[PDB]
Amino acid sequence: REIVHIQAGQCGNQIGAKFWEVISDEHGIDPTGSYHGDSDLQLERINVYYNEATGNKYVPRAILVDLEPGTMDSVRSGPFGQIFRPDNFVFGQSGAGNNWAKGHYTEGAELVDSVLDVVRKESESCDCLQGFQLTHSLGGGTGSGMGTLLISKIREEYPDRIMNTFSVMPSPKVSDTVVEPYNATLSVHQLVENTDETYCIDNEALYDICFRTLKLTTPTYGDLNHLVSATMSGVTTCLRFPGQLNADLRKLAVNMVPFPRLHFFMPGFAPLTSRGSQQYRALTVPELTQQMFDSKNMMAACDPRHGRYLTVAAIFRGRMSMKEVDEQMLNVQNKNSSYFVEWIPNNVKTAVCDIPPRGLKMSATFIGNSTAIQELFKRISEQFTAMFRRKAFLHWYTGEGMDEMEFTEAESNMNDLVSEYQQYQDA
Amino acid sequence: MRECISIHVGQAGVQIGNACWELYCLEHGIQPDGQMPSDKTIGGGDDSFNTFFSETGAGKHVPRAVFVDLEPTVIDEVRTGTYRQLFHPEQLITGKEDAANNYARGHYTIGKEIIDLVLDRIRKLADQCTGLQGFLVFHSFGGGTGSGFTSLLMERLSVDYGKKSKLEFSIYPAPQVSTAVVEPYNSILTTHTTLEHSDCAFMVDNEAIYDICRRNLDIERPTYTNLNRLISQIVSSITASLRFDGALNVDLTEFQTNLVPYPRIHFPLATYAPVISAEKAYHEQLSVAEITNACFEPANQMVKCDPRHGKYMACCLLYRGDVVPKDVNAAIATIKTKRSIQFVDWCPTGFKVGINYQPPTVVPGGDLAKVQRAVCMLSNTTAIAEAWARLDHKFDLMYAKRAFVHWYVGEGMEEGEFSEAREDMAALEKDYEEVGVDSV
Numbered sequence A: 001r002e003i004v005h006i007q008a009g010q011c012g013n014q015i016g017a018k019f020w021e022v023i024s025d026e027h028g029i030d031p032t033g034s035y036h037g038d039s040d041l042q043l044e045r046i047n048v049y050y051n052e053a054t055g056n057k058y059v060p061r062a063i064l065v066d067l068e069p070g071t072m073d074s075v076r077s078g079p080f081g082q083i084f085r086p087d088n089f090v091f092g093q094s095g096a097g098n099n100w101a102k103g104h105y106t107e108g109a110e111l112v113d114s115v116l117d118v119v120r121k122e123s124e125s126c127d128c129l130q131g132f133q134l135t136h137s138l139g140g141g142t143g144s145g146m147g148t149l150l151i152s153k154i155r156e157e158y159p160d161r162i163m164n165t166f167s168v169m170p171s172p173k174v175s176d177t178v179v180e181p182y183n184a185t186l187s188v189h190q191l192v193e194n195t196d197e198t199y200c201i202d203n204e205a206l207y208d209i210c211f212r213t214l215k216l217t218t219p220t221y222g223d224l225n226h227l228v229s230a231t232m233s234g235v236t237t238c239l240r241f242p243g244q245l246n247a248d249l250r251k252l253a254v255n256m257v258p259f260p261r262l263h264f265f266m267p268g269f270a271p272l273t274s275r276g277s278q279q280y281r282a283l284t285v286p287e288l289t290q291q292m293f294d295s296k297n298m299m300a301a302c303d304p305r306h307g308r309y310l311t312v313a314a315i316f317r318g319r320m321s322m323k324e325v326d327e328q329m330l331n332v333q334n335k336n337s338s339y340f341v342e343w344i345p346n347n348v349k350t351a352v353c354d355i356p357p358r359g360l361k362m363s364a365t366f367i368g369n370s371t372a373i374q375e376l377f378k379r380i381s382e383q384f385t386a387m388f389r390r391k392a393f394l395h396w397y398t399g400e401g402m403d404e405m406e407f408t409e410a411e412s413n414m415n416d417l418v419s420e421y422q423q424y425q426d427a
Numbered sequence B: 001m002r003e004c005i006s007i008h009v010g011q012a013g014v015q016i017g018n019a020c021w022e023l024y025c026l027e028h029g030i031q032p033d034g035q036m037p038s039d040k041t042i043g044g045g046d047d048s049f050n051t052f053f054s055e056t057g058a059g060k061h062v063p064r065a066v067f068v069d070l071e072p073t074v075i076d077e078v079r080t081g082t083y084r085q086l087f088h089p090e091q092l093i094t095g096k097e098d099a100a101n102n103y104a105r106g107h108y109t110i111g112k113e114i115i116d117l118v119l120d121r122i123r124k125l126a127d128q129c130t131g132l133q134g135f136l137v138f139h140s141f142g143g144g145t146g147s148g149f150t151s152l153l154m155e156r157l158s159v160d161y162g163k164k165s166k167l168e169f170s171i172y173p174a175p176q177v178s179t180a181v182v183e184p185y186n187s188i189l190t191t192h193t194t195l196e197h198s199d200c201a202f203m204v205d206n207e208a209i210y211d212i213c214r215r216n217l218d219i220e221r222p223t224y225t226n227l228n229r230l231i232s233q234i235v236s237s238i239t240a241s242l243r244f245d246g247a248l249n250v251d252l253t254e255f256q257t258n259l260v261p262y263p264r265i266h267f268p269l270a271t272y273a274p275v276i277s278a279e280k281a282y283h284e285q286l287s288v289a290e291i292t293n294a295c296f297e298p299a300n301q302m303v304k305c306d307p308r309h310g311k312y313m314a315c316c317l318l319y320r321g322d323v324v325p326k327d328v329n330a331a332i333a334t335i336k337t338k339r340s341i342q343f344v345d346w347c348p349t350g351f352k353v354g355i356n357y358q359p360p361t362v363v364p365g366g367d368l369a370k371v372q373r374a375v376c377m378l379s380n381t382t383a384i385a386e387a388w389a390r391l392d393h394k395f396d397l398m399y400a401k402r403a404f405v406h407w408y409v410g411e412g413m414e415e416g417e418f419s420e421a422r423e424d425m426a427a428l429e430k431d432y433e434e435v436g437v438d439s440v
Ligand SMILES: Nc1nc2c(ncn2[C@@H]2O[C@H](COP(=O)(O)OP(=O)(O)OP(=O)(O)O)[C@@H](O)[C@H]2O)c(=O)[nH]1
Pocket: B009, B010, B011, B012, B013, B015, B016, B070, B098, B099, B100, B101, B102, B106, B139, B140, B141, B142, B143, B144, B145, B146, B147, B171, B173, B174, B177, B178, B179, B180, B183, B206, B224, B225, B227, B228, B231
């Protein structure tokens, strides 16, 4: 059951590269693609994410995409950059200028067939393709505009495969341009229709965590991406390793999404750690459980107590008592039962994996489908309309052939998404 | 790639081009003969400085530039000056009769005789670009060539290079150093004709630059050379992101996204600091907080106007030298509490920041002290429309009596071109009023 990974644009390729660094280390693959590994749990499901090449090398099933060559050069210059298959670098030259319209309609359209050709080659070698995972931001032009263009075309050619994304939401606290709310809103409209699951990675939350919890005065994208790579490693655990669950992307979708459009997840992680500085006391299973459910550990800047959990998936990594894990997980639900919808019985499922992530003896990763995610979309909707009511900065988009009407439809669809999440928060 | 071609038009544009390219050579280690010892890429390369310089097989680094004037006097000094070997002779274009301070002669009578040759030379530069990004056009508002030939060229460039980016550095007239009484006419005519063909235009008010040289450099009566050394420092700050690499470098085109909310509102206010004499910089280092603060002191603006009585639609900070984001963020936070920075209600209030580590260079024998860190702020403020108001008023005093209009009519222009141009300016001044009004 092979997954095809695609990373698009500046943010997509930077968090994409970190993800492949991190899970390669967990599976015992070095920058050359060779396995110098301790345990054999590391290789049992290694084919979900890695093609095997002659000479027992492991090559990521990864495609790197950008309309601008710069950050893909840095990836190839990067530590594990030599592990990626060079044919799977697909890039243009003109960039996207932080413009969804250029990524989606004019620049990205010129390049998208070359990417689909690379997607096809990787898929035809798959015994049974699960589907795809895309890393991208929603605030730029390439990951957002061309990424959602790729999703739409991938769906046309593979309509029975699962589409999963890790989507980084823009925040004024960590912001490149004023038009991010425009790019994000146009993208969400695409994500609502064309993904089965998207992890909402909120740059607001990543910033708040670094500043407040990790006491990092001036957080860089490097500090943000340490959080992102830890979250990506955790939420993938049950796809990559053998366990009592043996999950795949479709089963995750079936068990997490009660209504098709409500497929946007708040990820959570514990313990929260900053890069480089290690702390030497492991948590207790009781500590892991409380931190993973704490709003201060959510990667989407929403208060869970402002909504209800439709479904939750939790994964505990490290050598620990599964009895204690079970008791602590039962404890949080029984003590906080009002925050779990009563009409989905037993909507919390826990998995355990023996292999911990690098640098931690124990970790807990949280995947929540909460109606509180609507706060994220409301925040973006306010920033959109603040400019849109004066049609501010629109010429960047009408200059690529876009119409105001398209902005009105995307805003209206995202408002409907907020309404639907509100509908189930009271039931 | 991503090459930029510079076009220097008329006296002011040519002479400012001299200052700028001299400063660029010093910043990149390019000698007057065009040799650059640290460039190991002989005859080519995709380095950052290659956006502004091409390379010959003989190792010569050549400005991607064209100098055009309708008379030979000013460009002849480039042909015989310190940097003559830098330019290929075909890059330096001269006619024989200037525009005689008359937009109609720059645009029609004299200008039309040389425009095709100028576009042939520009085309030869574009054909050497693998990724041409656009043009930087330097000229005065007030000269006959800077106004009339520039607008003719901008029109022809839109035809020949679609909507390829076109940026302007425009010298706004001041009585202290102006040369003609009809400069208000030429300014309004060229602003009107060029408005649709320009994406972004940096106005430099000669009175603001003249005051800064007098106040901060203790120059009793500044010359063009004094003004241009300061102006080239500002131009260098704006183009530094295109010409240097950097982890914290932010591309000028990314600032443009923020600076231009509507096509016609494309005139950023530039403020530069520190401008300080050697005598005063001695044993006196200016911190990130001090130079940032100075960007909100109106006396340091490139255009006289009062942003304290206007509204902001964008605010960008371009740092160069020994600056780290932590100092910048600290300086901004205190400034927000202590200063009159009111944004329009439809745009976000954050400040966009770029840092290039290469510290500022000074021309030997100049007046500026060499400093460790400098900053250019680029703000979209409704206040910049005051400069339009002053010019439109001067235009109105003369035009009501039709004073001097016969010199333009005698070259084939019609009165309707004047009123059409003045109406566009009135609508521009009104555009700036409307963007500042609260939403409903
Ligand atoms: N900052 C600066 N401004 C200049 C310089 N030279 C001329 N100007 C300004 O330009 C205005 C007149 O335009 P010019 O460029 O001199 O005239 P021109 O472009 O040669 O066009 P012609 O009238 O045909 O000669 C004056 O108001 C000056 O203030 C200069 O070297 N530096």
